[PDB]
Enzyme design. Structure first.
Site, PDB file in Angstrom:
ATOM      1  N   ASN A  10       0.781  -1.229   0.000  1.00 49.19           N
ATOM      2  CA  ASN A  10       0.000   0.000   0.000  1.00 49.19           C
ATOM      3  C   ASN A  10       0.814   1.280   0.000  1.00 49.19           C
ATOM      4  O   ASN A  10       0.442   2.244  -0.673  1.00 49.19           O
ATOM      5  CB  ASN A  10      -0.997  -0.003   1.161  1.00 49.19           C
ATOM      6  CG  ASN A  10      -2.061  -1.063   1.004  1.00 49.19           C
ATOM      7  OD1 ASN A  10      -2.387  -1.471  -0.107  1.00 49.19           O
ATOM      8  ND2 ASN A  10      -2.617  -1.498   2.114  1.00 49.19           N
ATOM      9  N   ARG A  39       8.052 -10.800  -5.320  1.00 47.39           N
ATOM     10  CA  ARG A  39       7.650 -11.535  -6.530  1.00 47.39           C
ATOM     11  C   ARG A  39       8.585 -11.303  -7.717  1.00 47.39           C
ATOM     12  O   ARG A  39       8.392 -11.909  -8.774  1.00 47.39           O
ATOM     13  CB  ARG A  39       6.218 -11.189  -6.972  1.00 47.39           C
ATOM     14  CG  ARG A  39       5.067 -11.521  -6.022  1.00 47.39           C
ATOM     15  CD  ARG A  39       5.157 -12.917  -5.422  1.00 47.39           C
ATOM     16  NE  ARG A  39       5.334 -13.950  -6.438  1.00 47.39           N
ATOM     17  CZ  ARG A  39       5.684 -15.207  -6.179  1.00 47.39           C
ATOM     18  NH1 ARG A  39       5.889 -15.612  -4.930  1.00 47.39           N
ATOM     19  NH2 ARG A  39       5.822 -16.063  -7.177  1.00 47.39           N
ATOM     20  N   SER A  73       9.502  -0.995   1.785  1.00 46.74           N
ATOM     21  CA  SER A  73       9.303  -2.419   1.967  1.00 46.74           C
ATOM     22  C   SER A  73       8.980  -2.709   3.436  1.00 46.74           C
ATOM     23  O   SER A  73       9.076  -1.819   4.284  1.00 46.74           O
ATOM     24  CB  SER A  73      10.543  -3.202   1.500  1.00 46.74           C
ATOM     25  OG  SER A  73      11.671  -2.999   2.356  1.00 46.74           O
ATOM     26  N   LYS A 102      11.396   1.396   9.043  1.00 51.67           N
ATOM     27  CA  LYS A 102      11.986   1.708  10.347  1.00 51.67           C
ATOM     28  C   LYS A 102      13.116   0.790  10.770  1.00 51.67           C
ATOM     29  O   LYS A 102      13.998   1.220  11.498  1.00 51.67           O
ATOM     30  CB  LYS A 102      10.927   1.658  11.438  1.00 51.67           C
ATOM     31  CG  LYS A 102      10.074   2.911  11.537  1.00 51.67           C
ATOM     32  CD  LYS A 102       8.973   2.689  12.572  1.00 51.67           C
ATOM     33  CE  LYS A 102       7.706   2.170  11.918  1.00 51.67           C
ATOM     34  NZ  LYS A 102       7.005   3.250  11.164  1.00 51.67           N
ATOM     35  N   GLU A 185      -5.572  -6.448  15.588  1.00 52.85           N
ATOM     36  CA  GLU A 185      -6.013  -7.765  15.118  1.00 52.85           C
ATOM     37  C   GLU A 185      -6.903  -8.438  16.150  1.00 52.85           C
ATOM     38  O   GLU A 185      -6.754  -8.226  17.351  1.00 52.85           O
ATOM     39  CB  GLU A 185      -4.807  -8.657  14.797  1.00 52.85           C
ATOM     40  N   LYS A 199      10.161   3.991  16.831  1.00 54.02           N
ATOM     41  CA  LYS A 199      10.106   5.392  16.433  1.00 54.02           C
ATOM     42  C   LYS A 199      10.924   6.309  17.327  1.00 54.02           C
ATOM     43  O   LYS A 199      11.683   7.128  16.844  1.00 54.02           O
ATOM     44  CB  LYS A 199       8.654   5.859  16.334  1.00 54.02           C
ATOM     45  CG  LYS A 199       7.923   5.214  15.161  1.00 54.02           C
ATOM     46  CD  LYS A 199       6.418   5.374  15.301  1.00 54.02           C
ATOM     47  CE  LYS A 199       5.725   4.685  14.134  1.00 54.02           C
ATOM     48  NZ  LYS A 199       4.244   4.736  14.310  1.00 54.02           N
TER      49      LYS A 199
END
Ligand code: NA
EC number: 1.1.1.3
Lengths: 300, 304
Positions: A10, A39, A73, A102, A185, A199
């Site tokens: 994204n 890929r 990535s 990061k 989640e 961070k």
């Protein structure tokens, strides 16, 4: 000016979109020479990723010979690879790096930046902290003043959960709502404080000059044992940590609620605070685009 | 790199001190060639001002031939002079400008900046808005984003008074205290009429939105003892593509500006990417001087 885009989830997709929206004259001569994912390698700038060749990021790098690597990535916190070794190789070739990843910086900031400085190679990394809200780049426009300490809310999911709790919602119900909204989640990974620790590690290195890695940070997250609490990230010359703490009504962080992030930078001259969104793929991509434009300006 | 410092009140003195503190290697080659005030021209860098020559800023400019003019003189909103004409002549000579003087920019923003762009001349003006808290310079690190609207608290004196008024202090005593701390003159009419915030929102709207407004386009009102009780009041400055205004308003508890108190200032910048807020001191001579010092370092980096 030729980019190699490493990553096309994204964030990379949002980055390519922003680049094509012609948002600055500084980007008129910028093209994406290739996009590389797990890929394979696409040697074209297209909206949809279709690999032209098999191969990893080092193969793409050697083939394309970009002027800049844009790393969007996935963060590999085990060892920062391949980004960590890739950055060092790029730097040795005089190839600039723009990153939202990061991990290499949370693990090996001084190694990377010492090398970059020695070679006069620029690194943009705004998108690593608070995404598109100037943090790293806010410090770039605060020259000539030593940072004494930094304090922030650097994780939106935990801030959202704690915001609900200060309004009388139980931990259990607040967590459920975060899950409902897709912020968590096993919510264990989303609420353990690690993201804020990564961070603040980066901020501490850059703004204070404290060579710190993620292993040096004393961090904890949120849980049912908490009773207006914020998950506070803190750094100074002596230490770096993340912990839930009560926040006074006297505090500019008080109103920083929901998924918002905020960073307070204290210098000898003044204390200032910036607040914004700290997540979102367009937001992170915009931190990278901002770095790209500053790079074209020679202002990194 | 030679500076001509126009003005030497509290901001000019703080600026000189900051420069002498050697805060960045970027400034090692920087010297003050002269200082000019209403009292004349001092062709030396001294802590204290003593005129060497009679004469005005134009005479000083002609004599010194500075590389940069640092304007910390008082804002003349009637016509912007002499700073307005000085900037145009300086730009024509290829001389960069760092300023904390709002008037020329509030009156002639597009003209001044168009002339500067055509000549490759740089203008630092961070100290004009929110002192040393990146505002103008925050927008410099928001490239490639379109500002939709801005909203903020942009005047220290009135925020200080309104903060005290919210604590049961009468407008009269709050004013008295603002005067005592050096925020308002003995006649405070012009310190509380909302004009300073109006000039600031004018500059921000021009720079960030491309809304070509001058001071004369802004609807503004100030503060007084007659404001509503039972509400926390802030002097809100606002601009978008359609309107620019300043007025005292009651502020909700969930508003990010609610706790921007004392002489703190804040700016909420809404762009096509994100809404952000920055806050920091909006008054204090060291702070305004630091805005100008920040611009000087950015200039040396070639990042204005
Ligand atoms: Na009330």
């Amino acid at each position: 000016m030729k980019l190699l885009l490493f990553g096309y989830g994204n964030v990379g997709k949002a980055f390519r979109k922003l680049l094509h929206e012609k948002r600055s004259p500084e980007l008129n001569d910028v093209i994406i020479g290739g996009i590389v994912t797990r890929r394979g390698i696409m040697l074209q700038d297209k909206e949809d990723f279709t690999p032209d060749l098999e191969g990893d990021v080092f193969k793409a790098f050697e083939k394309i010979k970009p002027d800049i690597i844009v790393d969007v990535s996935s963060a590999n916190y085990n060892n920062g690879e391949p980004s960590l070794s890739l950055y060092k190789e790029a730097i040795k070739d005089g190839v600039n790096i723009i990153t939202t990843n990061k991990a290499p910086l949370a693990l090996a900031f001084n190694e990377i930046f010492s090398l970059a400085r020695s070679k006069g190679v620029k690194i943009g990394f705004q998108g690593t902290v608070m995404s598109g809200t100037p943090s790293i780049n806010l410090y770039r426009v605060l020259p000539g003043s030593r940072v004494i300490k930094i304090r922030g809310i650097l994780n939106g999911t935990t801030n959202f959960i704690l915001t609900l709790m200060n309004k009388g919602v139980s931990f259990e119900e607040a967590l459920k709502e975060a899950q409902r909204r897709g912020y968590a989640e096993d919510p264990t990974l989303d609420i353990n404080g690690f993201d804020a620790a990564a961070k603040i590690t980066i901020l501490a290195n850059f703004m204070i000059g404290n060579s710190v890695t993620i292993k040096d940070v004393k961090f904890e997250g949120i849980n049912r044992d908490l009773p207006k609490i914020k998950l506070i990230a803190y750094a100074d010359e002596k230490e770096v940590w993340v912990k839930p703490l009560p926040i006074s009504q006297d505090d500019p962080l008080y109103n920083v609620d929901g998924v918002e992030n905020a960073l307070e930078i204290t210098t000898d001259i003044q204390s200032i605070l910036i607040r914004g969104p700290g997540a979102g793929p367009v937001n992170a991509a915009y931190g990278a685009l901002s770095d790209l434009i500053l790079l074209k300006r020679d202002c990194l």
